[PDB]
Amino acid sequence: NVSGSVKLWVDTTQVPYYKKIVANFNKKYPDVKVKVTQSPNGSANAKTDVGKDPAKAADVFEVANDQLGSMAEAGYINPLSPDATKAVKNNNVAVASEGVTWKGKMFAYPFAEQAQTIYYNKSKLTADDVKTWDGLTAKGVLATDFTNAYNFYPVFLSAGTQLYGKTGETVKGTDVNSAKGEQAMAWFAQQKSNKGVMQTSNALNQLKSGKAAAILDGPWNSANIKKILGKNFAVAPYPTIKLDGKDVQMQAFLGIETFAVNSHASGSNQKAAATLASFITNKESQLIVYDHSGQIPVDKTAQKSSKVASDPVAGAVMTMAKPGNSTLMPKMPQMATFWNDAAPLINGAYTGSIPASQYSTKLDTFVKNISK
Numbered sequence: 001n002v003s004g005s006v007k008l009w010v011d012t013t014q015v016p017y018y019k020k021i022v023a024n025f026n027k028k029y030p031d032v033k034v035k036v037t038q039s040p041n042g043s044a045n046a047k048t049d050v051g052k053d054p055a056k057a058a059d060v061f062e063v064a065n066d067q068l069g070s071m072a073e074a075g076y077i078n079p080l081s082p083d084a085t086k087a088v089k090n091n092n093v094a095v096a097s098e099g100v101t102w103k104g105k106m107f108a109y110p111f112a113e114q115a116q117t118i119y120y121n122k123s124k125l126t127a128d129d130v131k132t133w134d135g136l137t138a139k140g141v142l143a144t145d146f147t148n149a150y151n152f153y154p155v156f157l158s159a160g161t162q163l164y165g166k167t168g169e170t171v172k173g174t175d176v177n178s179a180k181g182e183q184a185m186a187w188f189a190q191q192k193s194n195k196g197v198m199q200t201s202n203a204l205n206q207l208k209s210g211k212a213a214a215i216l217d218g219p220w221n222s223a224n225i226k227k228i229l230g231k232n233f234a235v236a237p238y239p240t241i242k243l244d245g246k247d248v249q250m251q252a253f254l255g256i257e258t259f260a261v262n263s264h265a266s267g268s269n270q271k272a273a274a275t276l277a278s279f280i281t282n283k284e285s286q287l288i289v290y291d292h293s294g295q296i297p298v299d300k301t302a303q304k305s306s307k308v309a310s311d312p313v314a315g316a317v318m319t320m321a322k323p324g325n326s327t328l329m330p331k332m333p334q335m336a337t338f339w340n341d342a343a344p345l346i347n348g349a350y351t352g353s354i355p356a357s358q359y360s361t362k363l364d365t366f367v368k369n370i371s372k
């Protein structure tokens with residue numbers, strides 16, 4: 001039997017359908033009392049919302065894969081048991097297992113495969129127009145945010161640099177302090193004068209108002225964007241960009257969204273938390289998330305289901321996941337410093353706060369900063 005009381009943290013707009021998933025959980029585990037709330041500062045802040053006060057934080061909480069190495073090293077999450085690991089590995093696609101694995105051990109329960117794509121109004125741009133960045137932006141406005149390093153750091157990967165080495169595990173392996181890194185900086189700077197590129201803190205709202213023909217966004221907004229665009233909805237994988245005169249695919253990050261179990265819980269509450277985390281990341285639950293938000297399951301069976309297999313967003317995400325089209329977000333403990341420093345590096349190049357004469361210096365400083 002499973003008994004106990006557990007608190008579950010999800011994002012604000014996910015609460016209604018996680019209550020449905022928890023109702024399904026309670027059909028099987030009637031004696032577990034679950035309280036579902038939104039998290040204090042959203043899934044993007046999980047490591048900080050938990051770490052501020054582990055005993056007060058949720059027992060099961062939503063967290064993206066990049067945060068897991070920090071939380072594992074800090075002791076906030078324990079490794080999954082051998083049986084739990086076996087189930088994650090058997091049930092989900094390989095990149096989901098890689099996403100939750102730190103130094104050979106799994107630390108979370110994966111549920112969604114995330115890659116940004118182009119979402120666009122097909123009455124304003126054609127499928128051919130969206131194949132190249134310059135061609136798209138010559139024909140319509142793409143709204144985006146150069147202050148968000150998740151959006152734009154992968155241009156450095158398109159440029160041929162590595163982030164924490166070959167597989168994202170090498171502390172000193174970021175090599176953007178190079179001519180290749182400068183090519184990416186120059187690309188950001190070029191976009192400031194591209195009249196088809198609109199800087200905004202809310203690209204989705206510019207799509208909704210009709211001021212943008214296209215945005216870069218992820219599958220957490222798939223259903224939202226389908227509603228906004230209606231019969232004009234279209235999606236495509238990321239386009240090519242020109243770096244040093246060559247056309248190369250513009251990358252996105254590949255992220256894996258997960259639930260983790262707070263290591264504070266003990267006794268029956270710990271068992272209940274692990275059971276809940278397994279359940280809410282199972283195939284049925286992933287498909288409920290898909291039905292509501294359009295997020296893409298990591299479950300092998302769910303991905304091949306007719307419903308997901310026919311969704312154009314799923315197809316674009318599966319393209320994005322291929323080598324060369326994205327890179328899995330690393331999960332080094334240094335990732336907080338990486339994100340903090342990457343955003344001003346990129347935005348400084350875009351706005352001109354960092355002029356070309358400073359690219360090499362700033363990239364050298366960046367590598368030192370993120371490699372401690």
Ligand SMILES: OC[C@H]1O[C@@H]2O[C@H]3[C@H](O)[C@@H](O)[C@@H](O[C@H]4[C@H](O)[C@@H](O)[C@@H](O[C@H]5[C@H](O)[C@@H](O)[C@@H](O[C@H]6[C@H](O)[C@@H](O)[C@@H](O[C@H]7[C@H](O)[C@@H](O)[C@@H](O[C@H]1[C@H](O)[C@H]2O)O[C@@H]7CO)O[C@@H]6CO)O[C@@H]5CO)O[C@@H]4CO)O[C@@H]3CO
Nearest residue numbers: 011041042043044045064066067114148149150220255339
């Ligand atoms: O912008 C939307 C976001 O805004 C608000 O969050 C605050 C947040 O509370 C602050 O802590 C801070 O965020 C920091 C993070 O703390 C820091 O870790 C880092 O974040 C990086 C993430 O760790 C990394 O995973 C990735 O984030 C992706 C993520 O993988 C995607 O799943 C997707 O996340 C969605 C979130 O799950 C969701 O909560 C919401 O996020 C809000 C948040 O709720 C709100 O309170 O929507 C997003 C999708 O739009 O996308 C994110 C990328 O945006 O990359 C980030 C780095 O970009 O750095 C951030 C920023 O410095 O600040 C934000 C407000 O800016």
